[PDB]
UniProtKB/Swiss-Prot annotation:
PROSITE patterns hit by this protein: DNA_POLYMERASE_B (PS00116), INTEIN_C_TER (PS50818), INTEIN_ENDONUCLEASE (PS50819), INTEIN_N_TER (PS50817)
Described purpose of this protein according to its UniProt entry: Has high processivity, a high polymerization rate and high fidelity. In addition to polymerase activity, also exhibits 3' to 5' exonuclease activity. Intein encoded endonucleases are thought to mediate intein mobility by site-specific recombination initiated by endonuclease cleavage at the 'homing site' in genes that lack the intein. Given the high intracellular K(+) content (>0.5 M), PI-PkoII is probably more active than PI-PkoI in vivo.
Record protein name field: DNA polymerase
Cystine bridges: C428-C442, C506-C509
UniProt lineage: Archaea, Methanobacteriati, Methanobacteriota, Thermococci, Thermococcales
Applications reported: Pyrococcus kodakaraensis enzyme is a very fast, thermostable DNA polymerase (130 nucleotides/s) used in high-performance PCR.
Annotated source species: Thermococcus kodakarensis (strain ATCC BAA-918 / JCM 12380 / KOD1)
Post-translational modification: Undergoes a protein self splicing that involves a post-translational excision of the intervening region (intein) followed by peptide ligation.
Gene name, Swiss-Prot/TrEMBL: pol
Length: 729
């Protein structure tokens, strides 16, 4: 199983190393036959002479052109003749390309910006993360001593916690008493044990949360100041800090630094991405947070380091639990894209797709276009973003059904064969024109992207076959993450077409894909109604909620299957409309903002909440009352009446005192001035409601919640009166 690739320079020549883990232990392969290279477009094969004599200087030394050979390729299908220029060292390229482009005899240069190591993989058909071999993993976190102001890494590292499959343990240099805490001597001896532990268990992956930006960089300083070789590397090297975009990424040769942060951020949408947040989000558990200010004072005074260890202990357990839930999916995406997991885990859907095509392009002797130069990159970003969707039919509905298209966009691409290599391709005898936009797409021959998309799905098929043909809980899971990956890559193509940085950029393609989509939605939507007596209530790209005004809950279903079959046979190539589910009721308010109820409770649709990143003010209860009052009970006025009985109750001081406390974490400062000289609850009257300011002996709430906390919450859902229609003085 290949883990990664990279290279060493021996006598000026580049040496590629294939960090792989065969059944058993670590192993490093070496290939010193691979030469760097890139293409050139010439105006005349005569100029090849003046070119091969072009040179640049690197490290005071001269960089010449090694060997050249004219090759046959395809640029977007059309045949093309280019020259392949080989060089001795990889770094030679980034230094000679620009001088070769300047040449007037040279029209252009291609494939000159692909990491030598990355290139090795593609050219040599190798594939990272294959087989069923297991990887040893170990997650770790760092707890330091912060003091605002002082330069970074100023203070020493307090502990080195680490999870691993065996059990989370903590490495502290001061003293604490816990069956899982090992005290040492100084801050130095701590970092030495970790290294000895890491070097001992010798893991394949190292899991960290934001380790690319903090953890590792910290250990760096703390190692120089204390003079200590951080030989974390499998070969004895130190973490190499690569610079990506405007951030950093830490590597550990021979190992796989899996920093979750970039990944978690790309997989979930949350207001804050703290470990505590993420954890609960993914497992539904609490997860407590011990703040820096607390760790310090707790360390200096030595007062209860029991928490700083417990905390760090969890931080590792969390990072590991989390890490094991996300590394699988990742390895498959890595395996599918044919690139390192470390790379993949840090790339965007776009770059995944981008890497995918670079591989199949090679395999297809298809020369690859270049990236946009600043001017162009900067242009494609000025593009206009405008999505269509029919406004949701207000009011409550019964016997609602939802129908989505199976992989709409992808299906479209493959059908019509939308591809930058078939866009306006003259010479074909048959085309397909995208609505409104009209871009013509040749059908005479399968287009690059399409051809590929079809295979991705053609294999998506095989993947599911074995899915049942297998009774091994494991094999099915592996296969599962596989099919999931293929799905992703596929649902990435469309966006990629419009990705500013995309080599195979194609706004025309994008536009067309979206247009067709709309034509198919509107097209199907019209049919379902004027042929089967339905009523599309809420619509959205790729799917819609329909139903039959006053119809039999079961009859609709039986009638919702006839239709499908009908438009399905009336639909083109891969376009296939499916059935999603059945809901008894549900009302809609503005696109994406709705809610419905299946046949067994469940707020199901609840996308419309909108809060204050907490429990608001115990006036959330009212929100649920209303929803169920609407979706479940199916009663209109009952919903408005509740609030009318709520705002007519809180004012007359009939609402409990506890159901009005705003336990929020860091207005709040208006009362955050008394506790003095991150989780304090209060009762707007604006006092501290602990065991004081609330005895019922002589208390008084406030109206800052009736018409400012409950109304703003119900208002939206209530649709269709005014706050005044609910306040009723």
């Amino acid at each position: 199983m290949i883990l990664d690739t990279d290279y060493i320079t021996e006598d000026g020549k580049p040496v590629i190393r294939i960090f792989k883990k065969e059944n058993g232990e670590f192993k490093i392969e070496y290939d010193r036959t691979f030469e760097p290279y890139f293409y050139a477009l010439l105006k005349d094969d005569s100029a090849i002479e003046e070119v091969k004599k072009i040179t640049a200087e690197r490290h005071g030394t001269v960089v010449t052109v090694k060997r050249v050979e004219k090759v046959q390729k395809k640029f977007l299908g059309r045949p093309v003749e280019v020259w392949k220029l080989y060089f001795t060292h990889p770094q030679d390229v980034p230094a000679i390309r620009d001088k070769i482009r300047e040449h007037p005899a040279v029209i252009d240069i291609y494939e000159y910006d692909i990491p030598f190591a990355k290139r090795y993989l593609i050219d040599k058909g190798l594939v990272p993360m294959e087989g069923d071999e297991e990887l040893k993993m170990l997650a770790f976190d760092i707890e330091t001593l912060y003091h605002e102001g002082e330069e970074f890494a100023e203070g020493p590292i307090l502990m080195i916690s680490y999870a691993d499959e065996e059990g989370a343990r903590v490495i502290t240099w001061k003293n604490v008493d816990l069956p899982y805490v090992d005290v040492v001597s100084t801050e130095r001896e701590m970092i030495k044990r970790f290294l000895r532990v890491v070097k001992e268990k010798d893991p394949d992956v190292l899991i960290t949360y934001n380790g690319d930006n903090f953890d590792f960089a910290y250990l760096k300083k703390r190692c120089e100041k204390l003079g200590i070789n951080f030989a974390l590397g499998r070969d004895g090297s130190e973490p190499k800090i690569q610079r990506m975009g405007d951030r950093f990424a830490v590597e550990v040769k021979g190992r796989i630094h899996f920093d979750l942060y970039p990944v978690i951020r790309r997989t979930i949408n949350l207001p804050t991405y703290t470990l505590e947040a993420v954890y609960e989000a993914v497992f539904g558990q609490p997860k407590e947070k011990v703040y820096a200010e607390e760790i310090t004072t707790a360390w200096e005074t030595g007062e209860n380091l029991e928490r700083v260890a417990r905390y760090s202990m969890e931080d590792a357990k969390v990072t590991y639990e989390l890490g094991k839930e996300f590394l699988p999916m990742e390895a498959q995406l890595s395996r599918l894209i044919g690139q390192s997991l470390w790379d993949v885990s840090r790339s965007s859907t776009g770059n995944l797709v981008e890497w995918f095509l670079l591989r199949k392009a090679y395999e297809r002797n298809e020369l690859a276009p270049n990236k946009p130069d600043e001017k162009e990159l900067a242009r494609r970003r000025q593009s206009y973003e405008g999505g269509y969707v029919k406004e949701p039919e207000r009011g409550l509905w019964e016997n609602i059904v939802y129908l989505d298209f199976r992989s709409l966009y992808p299906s479209i691409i493959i059908t019509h064969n939308v591809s930058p290599d078939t866009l306006n391709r003259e010479g074909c005898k048959e085309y397909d024109v995208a609505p409104q936009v009209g871009h013509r797409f040749c059908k005479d021959f399968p287009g690059f992207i399409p051809s590929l998309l079809g295979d991705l799905l053609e294999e998506r098929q095989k993947i599911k076959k074995k899915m049942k043909a297998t009774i091994d809980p494991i094999e099915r899971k592996l296969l599962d993450y596989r099919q999931r990956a293929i799905k992703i890559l596929a649902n990435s193509y469309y966006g990629y077409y419009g990705y500013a940085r995309a080599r195979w950029y194609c706004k025309e393609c994008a536009e067309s894909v979206t247009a067709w989509g709309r034509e198919y939605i509107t097209m199907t939507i019209k049919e379902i109604e004027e042929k089967y007596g339905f009523k599309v209530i809420y619509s959205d790209t790729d799917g819609f909620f329909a139903t039959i005004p006053g119809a039999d809950a079961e009859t609709v279903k039986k009638k919702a299957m006839e239709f499908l079959k009908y438009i399905n046979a009336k639909l083109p190539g891969a376009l296939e409309l499916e059935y999603e589910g059945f809901y008894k009721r549900g009302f809609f308010v503005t696109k994406k903002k709705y809610a419905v109820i299946d046949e067994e409770g469940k707020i199901t649709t609840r996308g419309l909440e909108i809060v204050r990143r907490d429990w608001s003010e115990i006036a959330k209860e009212t929100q649920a009352r209303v929803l169920e009052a609407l979706l479940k009970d199916g009663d209109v006025e009952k919903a408005v009446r509740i609030v009318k009985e709520v705002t007519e109750k809180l004012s007359k001081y009939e609402v409990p005192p506890e159901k009005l406390v705003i336990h929020e974490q860091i207005p709040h400062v208006a009362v955050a001035k008394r506790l003095a000289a991150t989780v304090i609850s209060y009762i707007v009257l604006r006092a501290i409601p602990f065991d004081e300011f609330d005895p019922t002996k002589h208390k008084y709430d406030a109206e800052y919640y009736i018409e400012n906390q409950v109304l703003p919450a119900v208002e939206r859902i209530l649709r269709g009166y005014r706050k005044e229609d609910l306040r009723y003085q």
